[PDB]
C-alpha cells in the first residue's frame, strides 16, 4: 500500500477505511509515522519524585526507562543494553543510581552513561570508547503540569504547541486547580482491539454512553443515571466538542464533576468541585472556572486518554493491529483530603479498571469493530464520522479550536482522523505541517 496516495481518511475526516483497525502493514507503518514522531505519555512527577526514582514505560512497542536525575530533570532511555541487546530493567518501578545488565555485567548510570565494564582494563584495555556507548536516549521529554511525555523525534513541536487548542480546555483542571497527581500503580490489561478504537471512543464519543453503558448508568446511580437506555436526551447546551490541529480533542459535559462515580461519592465531589469553582471565578473567569468542574473526555494524540472529574487516565499501548495493552491510572487533585483521594482512586478502578464494570461494557464494541477490519468484505468499507458535520466553527470568541456547540457529535473524530491521515502520508514533521496548513478550514468546510 502506497501511504502517500492511499486515501485512508476522506476529506474533512468524514470517513475512515475499516482496514485501519486491522491491517498489520499499516500498524508497522504507524510505528514509524505515528509512534516514533508524536508525543507519548510516560509518567507523572508524583510517580518518580525523588532522585534515582524510575519507572519503565512503553513508547509504541519500544520500552523505555524514565528516570529522575540528580539535577531534578527527567531523562528517558531505551531499556536495552548497548552490548548484546538484553533488556536492562525487569521491574516496573524502583529507585537506583544505575542499572547493571545481568548478561555480562555492564553498568549504566541513571543518566544513561556507560559507567563500568567488568575487568575493563584487562579485557578492553583502552580500546572501549564508553562515551559513545551510553543507552539510546529519547530525544524529547517534556512536562505538562507534572504529566511527562516523551518523543523520539527531535523535529517535533514543543508539547504545549502540540496540545494546541485543547490546552485551554485542560488548564483549569491541570493548572488552576492547584495541580493534579497520578495515583499508581496502574491496572494493566490486554484487549483484542486496535489502539485507535478506545482512542477514538474517548476523544469524541458521548453518543455511545446512553446505550453502551445503559446497565452501568442504571446500576451505579451516577450523575448521568438518567440517559440509561437512551431514556432521555441531554438538554440543549449540555456541552460541546472540540478538536485541534495536531489531533487532540475532547467532549465537554457541563458541570459533571462527580462523573462516573456512584452515589457514594457524588455529594462530596459535587461539594468539593463547587467550592473550588467559586474561588476560581475571580482568578480565571466564570467560563474557565466552570470548565474545571466539567467532565472532559479527551484524547491526547495519539494514544493517551482521560476523563477529568471521573479521574480516569488511560494509555492504549499498541502490540499489533488487533492487540492493545491498556494501562489505567487514577488522577486526583493534590489538595483533596487523603481519604477522598484513596476512595476516588478505588472508584476509578472500580468503574474503568481491569474489573471496571463500565469499561467492560465497551470491550465487545472495541474488539469486534477492530477485528472486523481484517474481514475480507469489510476492509474497504467506510466507517462514518459525519455527525454534526457542517455546524463546527473555528475562531470562536469564547471557545477556541474547531468546535461543535453540542454535547453529542463527531467533531473530535474528524480532527483526530485528519491529523492521522496527514501523519501517515507524511515522511516528517515539515510535511505534516504542509499537509495541515488549512486544517481548520478543512474541518468546518460546509459552515
Amino acid at each position: 500500500m502506497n501511504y502517500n496516495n492511499k486515501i485512508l481518511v476522506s476529506e474533512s475526516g468524514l470517513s475512515q477505511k475499516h482496514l485501519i483497525h486491522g491491517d498489520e502493514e499499516l500498524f508497522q507503518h504507524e510505528l514509524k509515522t505515528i509512534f516514533a514522531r508524536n508525543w507519548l505519555f510516560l509518567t507523572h512527577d508524583s510517580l518518580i519524585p525523588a532522585p534515582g526514582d524510575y519507572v519503565t514505560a512503553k513508547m509504541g512497542i519500544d520500552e523505555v526507562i524514565v528516570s529522575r536525575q540528580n539535577d531534578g530533570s527527567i531523562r528517558a532511555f531505551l531499556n536495552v543494553c548497548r552490548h548484546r541487546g538484553k533488556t536492562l530493567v525487569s521491574v516496573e518501578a524502583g529507585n537506583a543510581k544505575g542499572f547493571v545488565c545481568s548478561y555480562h555485567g555492564w553498568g549504566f548510570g541513571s543518566n544513561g552513561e556507560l559507567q563500568s565494564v567488568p575487568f575493563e582494563k584487562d579485557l578492553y584495555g583502552e580500546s572501549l570508547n564508553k562515551k559513545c556507548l551510553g543507552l539510546k536516549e529519547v530525544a524529547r521529554v517534556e512536562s505538562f503540569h507534572g504529566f511527562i511525555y516523551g518523543c523520539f523525534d527531535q523535529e517535533a513541536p514543543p508539547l504545549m504547541d502540540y496540545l494546541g487548542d485543547a490546552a485551554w480546555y485542560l488548564e483549569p483542571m491541570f493548572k488552576h486547580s492547584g495541580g493534579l497527581e497520578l495515583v499508581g500503580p496502574p491496572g494493566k490489561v490486554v484487549i483484542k482491539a486496535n489502539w485507535k478504537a478506545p482512542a477514538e471512543n474517548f476523544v469524541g464519543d458521548a453518543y455511545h454512553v446512553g446505550w453502551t453503558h445503559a446497565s452501568s448508568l442504571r446500576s451505579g446511580e451516577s450523575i448521568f443515571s438518567s440517559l440509561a437506555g437512551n431514556a432521555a436526551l441531554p438538554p440543549e447546551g449540555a456541552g460541546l466538542q472540540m478538536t485541534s490541529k495536531y489531533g487532540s480533542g475532547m467532549g465537554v459535559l457541563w458541570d459533571g464533576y462527580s462523573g462516573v462515580h456512584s452515589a457514594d461519592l457524588v455529594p462530596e465531589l459535587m461539594a468539593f468541585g463547587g467550592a473550588k469553582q467559586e474561588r476560581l471565578n475571580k482568578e480565571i473567569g466564570d467560563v474557565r472556572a466552570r470548565i474545571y468542574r466539567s467532565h472532559l473526555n479527551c484524547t491526547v494524540f495519539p494514544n493517551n486518554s482521560m476523563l477529568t472529574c471521573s479521574g480516569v487516565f488511560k494509555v492504549w499501548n499498541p502490540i499489533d493491529a488487533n492487540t492493545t495493552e491498556v494501562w489505567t491510572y487514577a488522577i486526583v487533585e493534590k489538595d483533596m483530603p487523603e481519604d477522598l483521594k484513596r476512595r476516588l482512586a478505588d472508584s476509578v478502578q472500580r468503574t474503568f479498571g481491569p474489573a471496571g464494570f463500565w469499561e467492560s461494557d465497551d470491550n465487545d464494541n472495541m474488539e469486534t469493530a477492530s477485528q472486523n477490519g481484517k474481514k475480507y468484505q469489510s476492509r474497504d468499507s467506510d466507517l462514518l464520522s459525519n455527525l454534526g458535520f457542517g455546524e463546527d466553527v473555528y475562531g470562536d470568541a469564547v471557545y477556541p479550536g474547531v468546535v461543535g456547540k453540542s454535547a453529542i457529535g463527531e467533531t473530535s473524530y474528524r480532527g483526530f482522523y485528519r491529523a492521522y491521515q496527514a501523519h501517515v502520508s507524511s515522511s516528517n514533521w515539515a510535511e505534516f505541517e504542509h499537509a495541515s496548513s488549512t486544517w481548520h478550514t478543512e474541518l468546518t468546510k460546509t459552515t
Binding site: 521491574v91 500503580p185 467492560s360
Partner: protein
Amino acid sequence: MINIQEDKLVSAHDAEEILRFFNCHDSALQQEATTLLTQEAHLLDIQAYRAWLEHCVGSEVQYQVISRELRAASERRYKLNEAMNVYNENFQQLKVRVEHQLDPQNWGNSPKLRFTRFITNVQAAMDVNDKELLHIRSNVILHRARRGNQVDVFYAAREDKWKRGEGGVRKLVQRFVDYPERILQTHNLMVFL
C-alpha cells in the same frame, strides 16, 4: 515454623498465614470449610448472584483483589503505592455489580456466559480472639467461556474470613486475593474469584 531471615523469598505476611494453619489440627472444621466453598462456587457457577449475596456474603464484607507492582527483590528505597485495587468492595458495591450483571441491557451477557470453578487446597482454622471467626484458605481456577471461541482461565489463592452471623449461617466477611499475573491476558478481570 518459618525463619524469614533464612527463607529469604518469604514475605512476613505469608509466614504469618502458614503459622495459623500448621496448628489447627482439626478435621471437622476442614470439612465444614470445604462444604462452604463448594456451595459458594456452585451458586456462582450458575450465576445465582443474588443467592450468593444473600447466603454467602456478610453485611460487613470486604471483597478485595489487588494487582501488585513489579519491584526489585532488593528494593528498599521506593515506597509509593505497591498495589492497586482491582476489587475493594463493601456489600453495597457488590450489590451494584450484581445489579449490573442482572440488568437486561447488559449486552455483554447475551448470549449467556459459561462459568466453571475449581476449588482446591482448602485449609481452615479458627481465629485466636474472635471465637466466631473462621480463617479459610483455598485456591481457585476459574474458567469463563463466551461467544463461541472466547476462553479465559484465572488462577489465584484466596485468604478468607468467614463468620456465623444470623441464621447460624457462616458467611464471608473478608476475601483477599493478590492476583498472580501482573498484566491480565484475559480481556478483563470481571469475575468473582
